[PDB]
Amino acid sequence: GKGTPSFGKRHNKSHTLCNRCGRRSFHVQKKTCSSCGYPAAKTRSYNWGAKAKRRHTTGTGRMRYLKHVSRRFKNGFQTGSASKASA
Amino acid sequence: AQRVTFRRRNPYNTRSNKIKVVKTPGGILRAQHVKKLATRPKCGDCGSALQGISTLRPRQ
Amino acid sequence: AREITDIKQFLELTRRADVKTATVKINKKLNKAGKPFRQTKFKVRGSSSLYTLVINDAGKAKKLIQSLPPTLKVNRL
Amino acid sequence: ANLRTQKRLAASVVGVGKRKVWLDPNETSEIAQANSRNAIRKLVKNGTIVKKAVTVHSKSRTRAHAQSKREGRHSGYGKRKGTREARLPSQVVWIRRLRVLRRLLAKYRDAGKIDKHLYHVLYKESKGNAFKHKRALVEHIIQAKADAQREK
Amino acid sequence: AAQKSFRIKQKMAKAKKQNRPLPQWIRLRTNNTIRYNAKRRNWRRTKMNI
RNA sequence: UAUUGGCGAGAGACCGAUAGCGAACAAGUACAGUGAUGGAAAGAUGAAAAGAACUUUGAAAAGAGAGUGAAAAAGUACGUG
RNA sequence: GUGCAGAUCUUGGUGGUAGUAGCAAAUAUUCAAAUGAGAACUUUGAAGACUGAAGUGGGGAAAGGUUCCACGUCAACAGCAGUUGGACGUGGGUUAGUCGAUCCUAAGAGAUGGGGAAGCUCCGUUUCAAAGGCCUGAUUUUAUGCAGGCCACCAUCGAAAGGGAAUCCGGUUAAGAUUCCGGAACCUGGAUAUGGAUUCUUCACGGUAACGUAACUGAAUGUGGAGACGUCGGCGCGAGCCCUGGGAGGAGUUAUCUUUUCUUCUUAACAGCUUAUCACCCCGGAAUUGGUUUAUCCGGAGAUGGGGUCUUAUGGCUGGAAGAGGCCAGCACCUUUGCUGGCUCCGGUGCGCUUGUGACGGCCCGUGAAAAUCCACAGGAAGGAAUAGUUUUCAUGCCAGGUCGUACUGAUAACCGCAGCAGGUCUCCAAGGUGAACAGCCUCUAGUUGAUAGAAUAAUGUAGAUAAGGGAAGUCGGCAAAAUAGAUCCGUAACUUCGGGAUAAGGAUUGGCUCUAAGGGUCGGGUACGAUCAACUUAGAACUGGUACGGACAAGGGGAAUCUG
Secondary structure, X not given: OOOOOHHHHOOOOXXXXXXXXXXXXXXXXXXXXXXXXXOOOOOXXXXXXXXXXXXXXXXXXXXXXXXXXXXXXXXXOOOOOOOOOOO | OOOOXXXXXXXXXXXXXXXXXXXXXXXXXXXEEEOOOOOOXXXXXXXXXXXXXXOOOOOO | OEEOOOXXXXXXXXOOOOOOEEEEEEEEEEOOOOOEEEEEEEEEEOOOOEEEEEEOOHHHHHHHXXXXXXXXXXXXX | OOOHHHHHHHHHHHOOOHHHOEEOOOOHHHHHOOOOHHHHHHHHHOOOEEOOOOOXXXXXXXXXXXXXXXXXXXXXXXXXXXXXXXXXXXXXHHHHHHHXXXXXXHHHHHHOOOOHHHHHHHHHXXXXXXXXXXXXXXHHHHHHHHHHHHOO | OOOOOHHXXXXXXXXHHOOOOOOOOHHHOOOOOOXXXXXXXXXXXXXXXX
């Protein structure tokens, strides 16, 4: 009575969606996310989880700001505008 | 022999979920939800219900 | 949802400046043993309640519709 | 054709189940165009969809049988399956009888047939026994009133 | 579920719009290699897991 | 002086789609698990769609023709096979 | 990074087996027409059945996520088929002041001040903390500085079943509705105007009293009540359902019978008047003790009695409201589809069923949550009219009530089981007969008729049975089956912890029909009875039959001991 008869009682979510990573890893009763975590500003990551950093690190997402930092540096952090030329 | 349903999304027979079956002017049975009954106010000394006071639910 | 029993209290109701409308409902009923008679219902609609005046004497009904104000949007039946 | 949704709509328009609507098997082209409920309400009106009246469940063999129980039949020993307390509890029999004996005693007392001292004796013997019924109480009252008049 | 939060109804609203095939003009594009929608979901073949 | 990260360059007696990173592709994707995590397969028509007008058989897929093409022994089940 | 036949090698592909095992639980399908190229399976009709109201019915919670609904459509999926579909393609659909969330707290979770710990973080939840804002004054620069007075509670999260402001009826859709539409209400917050009330005795009068009412000022602070509560038993009452009578409609049966069989006859929320057990008040002062419950408790700490007051669960009447809904009839018509009439009436009954409720009673070394919130009382701070004020807990008037969820399934096909799996999965409603029965068996409403089919009827299976004579000889062992069984009456042993054993053991009866007897309700007696109405319970008698009768269903085998708990 521990296999397919007991499997029909599984209708209560232990984990719901996380607000930091959208993962469905947020444990409801613990009030913490098992993948990133909602408590502790420190994103959950370990060195034994070598693949786990590869899915979540920088560059894996949009990089809405870091897209332009290497180009903004290359021009030496200009301010102003280009004025005019010919043609 | 006209069977009836609840009208709200509480399907359990709790204290807040009482039902009296009433006949509508459409000629059908329909359940209506009845609030929980008011107790009488009681005396501060003897504890007996004190007369001349209407028995309402407390916000009424 | 409230019956008015005083006919002169019904007449002061029609000039209460929220009663824009009314209606006169006629019901064919019997006078408690035999023959039919005409009962009429004078329903005025106030701003928060409907007042009803039942009139069994169909003669006294005739002296009441002339007593209604000329501005009331009387809906016969 | 496919008159499945005209079967479903007509059951809701008429007010019966789907087992009690009859679609005309000769007007299947006209029913197949009735895609709305205002069009179904037309097809009920000109007789294309009818109400298919209720299957009878007559109670006449009950009412004929129930008359014979009133006349006294079918109550022999081979027709009872429950215990005597199951068919009629002895507490209910006692409740019927003791409410009778209290009611005649209260009726006799305020009518002036018996007084208050004879009542209070008869109230506690009736709560006990030896008044099996209303007859056995009345012949006791008749005797005790006549004996107290004989004692007077 | 049948009485939901908005954060759950928002995620079905998105996954409803992703329940469609390719637009068929996509396959006519220059150097287009997309042959079919390879992320199509169905409710009785793979649950969303919320 | 160090530098398996970041950014920009140059290379090689390296691997050549079961190899090389897990991933040459909408790849940390689809999918699995309550979760931590696990995690694929999948490149090649042709120089060019010129991707088969039209006829016939068939309910239709399609067939037989006809056609395009250097080649359908290249027909979106496509290099060779 | 160099040669493969092996590593139960790795990955990918492929045979024999083999058109084989099989596609056999859940009673069951058949005829015709349509459609289509094609129909065992789609649709319509007819018939036969089933679930049998602890449903195969009507709704929901969790979960799913669009499966809901329409149109088109059949390559794959529906382990046969397919014109069908929970499939494929395209769209459509979820409307709220009142239903929930939101607010409150529960078990618990958890910051802050602090204190640990190298640290990730741990403890702790009012702590060894200088913990926070309430009603008005003072401004007539003018914005809110400052002046009296109090309050000290010391985060926050935690229930879509607990607590809780308030909405019902009718109609409408392809799919929505307590959400839309028509009518009719209520609540909260807010301004507010008029009337009523009060006032020259300033803050109402009446009643002996319980207390009454259209109102009838009351801050700080304090007290109290409601929220706020177990379980079982019987009784009373109500609601709905069931049963039944007359009448007004319709439908069925009609060889013969049947004043017959079936069916419609309904009244919401809200509001006004009235309505009760309990409780209380006045008069009176009781032994010859009285009242009274089904259940034995009450009375000089004031009974019985006479007269009253209240709670308004509940019911009756009226409004809502017949104009709605229902059942019919008569005319109309390629039409949107109409139009016009009636009737919608009065009862009866109960150990009935479900449910709510009241007064009680039993039980506990078990006495069966909290908080938000609301009201009252005490207090009398304070403001108050007479040439004119006070009041907005009385009546009417005016404005607004956000956000989010709302479709559908809820399971032998929408959830979880690798799946369209005989498994698992919380709950409400709940008809008739038999019968003690929510058992089994049959039917009404509602819903299905789904599960690969056709033909034969070998062996051996699986499920169900029956056997002459004997009766456990079978077997480790009466395993399996049979026998018994309901009710009524009789009769019951050893032993016992005196409660039991005990349905001990062991016997008899049981149908149908026709009668007999007993068990009741209400009405009028000035200060012995009779009319009438309505129950199913028990006992007995005659007759009757292929000795049958708990006639199907349902339903104990029993005893004498030993070991052991």
